[PDB]
Structures are given as C-alpha cells and as structure tokens.
C-alpha cells in the first residue's frame, strides 16, 4: 500500500478501531493494549488485561465543530494529513481520504476559506484556544445526528445516481484549424519553416562539462570558439524566419480564397501588370501597395478609354449614346462576319472621382 499511515487493530477481537471511540489498558503490565468499545463493553479480556482492578482510558473520536459548522476535528486533520502525503493541491484523492462523500469541489472550497482566505494567513482566525463557543453552541448528539442524516441520504442518492457517461475522446487541441495544412494560428508558427533543416547542424552538439574559459590564457579554447560560432549562424537563421513571417501577416496573404477570386475577376492585361509588380511588396506597407497597384490600373484604363474615343470621332459619331449603340452593332457585325473600367469612363455620366 502506498499510504504511509498506520492501521490500528484491536488486540482481542481484531476489529479495526482507528476511526471510532476506543479504550486502552493503561496498566504497565499491558503495553499498547487497545480494547474496542464492544470488547470493553462485552469485557472480552486477553493476555494480561484485567477489566476489574486496572484503571483505563477512554479515547474519544473528537467529533465536534471547531471552525466550520459542517466540519469536525477528525475531518480537519485528515485534510491536513492528506496534504502531507497526497500533496497540497491534489484535491481528488484527499477528498476520498477525508470520506463523508465530499466531492473535490467542497473540499477545495473549504480549505480556501478556512486557511488560504484567512486574514491570519499562516494560521486560522481562531488560533486562540481560549475561544470555545462553537463547541458549546451545538451539542455533540445533535451534530452527530446531522452527520448520520447527511451520510445516509448521500448514500441513497449515490445508489440511485445515474451512471457516469463514458469519457469521450480527449479534446485534442489540433492547432491545424486554419485553412492551410500545417499552420497554427494560435501559435503563429508553421510546421515546415523557411530553413527547417537548419537544426541538422546542432542537434548532435555537446559541450565539455565545467569548461568555457582557458585556465592559462583566459581566452576561449579553440574548440569552444568554434562551437559557439556554429551557434551564431543558427540564431541568424531564426531571425530570417521571423522577418518572412512578419511580411506574410501583413498584406493578408493567408486568405487564399479572397486573394484568388479577385485575380480571377480581373482581366488579362491587369493580371499581367499586377503579377509584374508583386515582388516590391516587401518594402511597402499595406496601404502603399494598394495605392501603387491601383495607380497602374488607373493609367491603363485611361489609355484604353482615350484610344476608344478617338476611334469614334473618326466615324462621325457625335454623342456618347450613339457611340455605345455603334459598338453593340459592330459586335453583332463581327459576329455576323459587369462593365469594365474602360466602359465606365465612357459612360454618359462620369464617375465622381474623375471631377
């Protein structure tokens, strides 16, 4: 048994007596001769015990409140004794040791109020033995009656209690939630980094115990200065990774669905231009990159509109309405043989941002 306690057995009936009212033979002839109340009631004597002419002692169970109206002396000790063995903090087992069907929560709450939340931090508040009100405020028989009453109903509740549901599979954290296999948004760390093979050079490294400085010269010995130099490179490798991660967070490059859709929506010429200016994002912040790209699109669309209009004026078209009509008929003729940026500038009403 892992428990470090001592089990007490009566010397006559061999009935466990540790947790009840008990009597002992105080005569020097008998040493550590304990007689349970039933034995000392029925008077079954053994060895040198004489129930007639030797004076004895009544060991009481010390069942009475001291601090809390719902706790007695025995429960308090088993709480403190459990702390020594099961360790202060392990509330599951210590609650089992105390008995009385007090779930770990009640035991945990009790200790915090009684001891941890006490103003006299290292001690309780009623450290003075002279205060004896709580013992005399409730009689022992009444307090015992409540203990028997709570115990029996709790036992009845437990017997009628529903069976516990089987433990579901442990809720694995699975940090791969993000919609990219091998990314951990909770940790901001990828699984396959820029130079994931950078650890291959220092994962067998070992150091000479107790060294670090030459006893004679006072300078690092040649092996040590070489070993540290191969650690400096690894640190720089870590820093390079961080900068790569820092850039990726900005510009919102983790939105595969959103970034792609717009690229699909755009036309062919715009797609080529944006693809050509992609590398420079390493140097500009988010807004500057947006301004930079938008400007290129603005110039390209303006050229198309101006070229479109100059073609109309050579055909003798003299109104924006008839120009669109002609384009529709031309599309039908070439077939016979949302609007784009170049189509919004040539509309009858100009956009507000071009005034």
């Amino acid at each position: 048994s892992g428990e470090g306690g001592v089990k007490y057995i009566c010397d006559v009936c061999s009935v466990d007596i540790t947790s009840t009212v008990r009597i002992r033979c105080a005569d020097p002839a008998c040493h550590d001769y304990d007689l349970c109340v039933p034995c000392f009631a029925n008077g079954s004597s053994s060895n040198a015990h004489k129930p007639a002419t030797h004076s004895f002692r009544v060991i009481e169970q010390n069942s009475f409140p001291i601090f809390d109206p719902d706790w007695g002396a025995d429960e308090e000790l088993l709480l403190l004794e459990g702390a020594e063995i099961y360790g202060l903090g392990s509330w599951a087992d210590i609650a089992d040791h105390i008995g009385g069907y007090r779930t770990k929560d009640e035991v945990r709450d009790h200790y915090l109020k009684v001891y941890i939340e006490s103003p006299n931090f290292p001690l309780p508040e009623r450290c003075s033995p002279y205060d004896l009100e709580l013992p005399n405020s409730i009689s022992r028989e009444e307090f015992q009656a409540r203990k028997k009453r709570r115990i029996e109903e709790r036992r009845e509740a437990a017997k009628n209690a529903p069976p516990p549901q089987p433990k579901t599979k442990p809720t694995a954290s699975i940090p791969a939630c993000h919609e990219i296999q091998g990314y951990m948004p909770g940790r901001l760390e990828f699984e396959t980094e820029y130079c994931n093979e950078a650890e291959e050079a220092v994962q067998l490294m070992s150091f000479d115990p107790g060294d670090g400085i030459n006893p004679r010269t006072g300078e690092l010995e040649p092996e040590m200065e070489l070993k540290l130099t191969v650690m400096e490179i690894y640190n720089n490798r870590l820093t390079q990774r961080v900068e790569r991660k820092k850039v990726i967070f900005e510009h919102n490059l983790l939105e595969y669905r959103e970034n792609t859709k717009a690229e699909k929506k755009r036309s062919r010429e715009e797609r080529e231009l944006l693809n050509k200016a992609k590398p420079f994002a390493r140097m500009m912040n988010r807004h500057d990159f947006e301004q930079f790209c938008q400007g290129l699109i603005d110039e390209l669309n303006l050229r198309q509109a101006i070229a479109q209009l100059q073609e109309w004026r050579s055909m003798r078209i003299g109104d924006l309405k008839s120009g669109e009509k002609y384009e529709q008929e031309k599309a039908l003729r070439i077939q016979k043989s949302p609007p784009s940026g170049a189509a919004l500038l040539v509309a009858p009403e100009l956009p507000a941002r071009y005034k």
Binding site: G87, I116, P122, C127, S139, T171, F207, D211, E232, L238
Partner: protein
C-alpha cells in the same frame, strides 16, 4: 528538510533560469538540458527537441552544480493573456535521480512563475511512466478549464495523457514543509485542549466487583459526553471505496503502465470511423470501465473480468485477426491473466 534543501543552502547546487539570449552561459545551460531530454525521450526525433529547447519564446529552469554541470530542468511556454502556461519537457539525470530533486524543482518553478506573472493554470501532456510523479505534485487527470481557453493553443503529443493543475493563490511553495506543520500544530493544540483521553478513569463500576457484564457505552459519563452512538460505530468501519479498490488500483495502474494496452487507453472517435459503433453494440474501453468502477456499478469481480473480456472481443470484432489490433488485443489478454494468475483469489476464474 530533504537532501536537496540542505545542498542548496550550503551552495552545492543552484538554479538558473535561462533563455536563448545568445550569451555564452545561456547556451551551455540550454545545450545541457537538450542532451538530458534527448536521453530520456528516445522515441521522439532529435531535431524536434533541438528546435523546442533553443526556441526564443520558451523559458527553462535548470539545476546547476559548481563546475557548470546541469542535472535537470523543465521547459514551458507562458501564455500571459490566457492565464495559463504549458509544460513541454521534464526530466532529471537517471544517475542522480535518487536524491529527490523532482519535488524541489517543481516548487521553484511554481514559485518563480507565481511571483513574476499572473498565470494560474498549468497544462501538460504527461508521459506514461511519469504519471505518479505528477499526481503527487497536485496535478489531476480531470480538466476544469473551458474548451475555448486552451484548444488550438497547446500541442498534441501522441502517447500522452493530458493533465491540469490550479495553483493556490497567495502561497509560497518552497517553505511548504514548515507551513503545513504550523497549520498541523495549530489544529492539534486545539484538539488537545478538549480530549479527555488523558484522564486515567477507574475500572467500570459494574466490573469493580469482579463480575464482567455488558455495559452500554452511552451510560458512562465520559463516553456519553463524547457523543458516541451505535450508528457511528458501525458506519465508521465502511471504507468510501470498494474493499478491493486498492488491489484493483494496483492492477489498473499495472495494465495502464503496460505498453501493450496502448490502443485501449482512449475510446475510438465516431467521426473517424462510422461502423465501429454500428457493429459493436457495447463499445467499451479502459476509461469507460474506470468511470463505472468509480460509480460502484461493478458489484462483483466477475463484472470486471467480463468487461475486460468484452474489450478484447470488441477489438477482435472490429479489427481482423491478421491485423495487429487483434493480435495485440489477445496478447494483452494474456498479460491480464498473468496479473490475475499472480492473484490467488482470481486465479480460478479463468475458463478452460
């Protein structure tokens, strides 16, 4: 005071908290811890351990001897805003394990984090053979934190068993051994202010004449004031758990300690496999039986044996004999009967 206590006081040992700043000493201490963890965890790759220890977001508390010798230490990553910290590695050199540094190292780590930040909860993935050490240090296998707090943040480790702790506020763990004694002394003196056992009472008046006849305990003045009752006397001799709990607890730990029971540590997931529940009308694993045992639904040993047999049958039923699932399942069955046969009481329950 354990040997670790005296050694630190006299200066034999010393604790160093070091991160990968880039100094000379910080690198030596980190590298020493790296080798120790590598020795004790041969299953995991060496590259993975090197990355975690030499990371820039982790800390590490180590025990260092006079000639820059490192004996043990722990590693953790504190989530300051989430009010909890994760423990990722822990080990002490096998040669020096007898001293008992495990208890004294945990106290320093708990004290240091407590007096430096506002973290409350610890979460870890304990090893299979380290469960005993963690339990004695206040940890529990039941989790009280909410799902959202730690899901997606800590890292899963196959072959582990998650555990949780709740540091008690406003306490200094290092001087625990003296503090609880004081609370023990405070209560004990209170008890000694009332107990009448110190009174050497005369022989019972009924037996003073040499005749031994039954005497009601409630009749005596001392006993009656003690509030003894027939009810409490009979009730005090019934242990909270079943009479065989300790023996089964020994066996339960043994089977869990056995590496051959790994597939049955946790139940199968419904999402991963759909036909597992459809084929098995009584799907059971070790966790399910243990919870039912805690509920006292198992009245007799035969229930435990039948449940253990049904586990193997379910594994054989869902998984083919040729597959390792059933062969290991039958191999584990042999291990159970090895323990049961070692027990004379249950040796006769094996069928022919």
């Amino acid at each position: 005071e354990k040997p670790a206590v005296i050694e630190e006081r006299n200066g034999e040992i010393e604790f160093r908290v070091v991160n990968n700043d880039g100094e000379r000493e910080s690198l030596i201490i980190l590298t020493g811890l790296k080798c120790i963890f590598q020795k004790q965890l041969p299953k995991m790759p060496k590259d993975y351990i090197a990355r975690l220890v030499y990371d820039r977001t982790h800390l590490s508390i180590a025990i260092v001897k006079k000639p820059l010798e490192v004996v043990g230490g722990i590693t953790y990553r504190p989530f300051k805003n989430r009010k909890f910290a994760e423990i990722v590695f822990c080990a002490i050199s096998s040669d020096q394990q007898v001293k008992g540094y495990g208890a004294h190292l945990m106290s320093h780590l708990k004290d240091y984090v407590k007096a430096t930040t506002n973290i409350e909860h610890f979460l870890t993935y304990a090893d299979n053979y380290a469960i005993g050490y963690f339990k004695k240090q206040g940890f529990t296998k039941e989790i009280t934190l909410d799902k959202s707090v730690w899901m997606g943040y800590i890292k899963d480790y196959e072959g582990g068993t998650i555990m949780q702790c709740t540091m008690i506020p406003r306490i200094r763990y290092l001087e625990q051994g003296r503090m609880l004694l004081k609370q023990k002394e405070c209560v004990q003196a209170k008890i000694r202010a009332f107990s009448k056992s110190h009174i050497v009472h005369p022989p019972p008046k009924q037996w003073r004449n040499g005749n031994v006849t039954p005497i009601d305990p409630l009749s005596i003045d001392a006993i009656r004031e003690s509030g003894w009752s027939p009810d409490m006397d009979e009730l005090a001799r019934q242990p909270r758990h079943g009479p065989n709990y300790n023996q089964l607890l020994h066996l339960l730990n043994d089977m869990q300690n056995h590496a051959s029971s790994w597939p049955f540590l946790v139940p199968v997931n419904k999402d991963e496999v759909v036909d597992y529940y459809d084929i098995i009308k009584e799907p059971m694993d070790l966790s399910t039986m243990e919870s039912k045992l805690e509920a006292d639904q198992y009245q007799t040993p035969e229930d435990f044996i039948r449940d253990a047999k049904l586990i193997f049958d379910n594994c054989r039923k869902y998984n083919n004999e040729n597959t390792p699932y059933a062969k290991s399942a039958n191999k584990l069955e042999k291990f159970m009967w090895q323990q049961i046969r070692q027990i004379p009481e249950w040796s006769h329950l094996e069928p022919s």
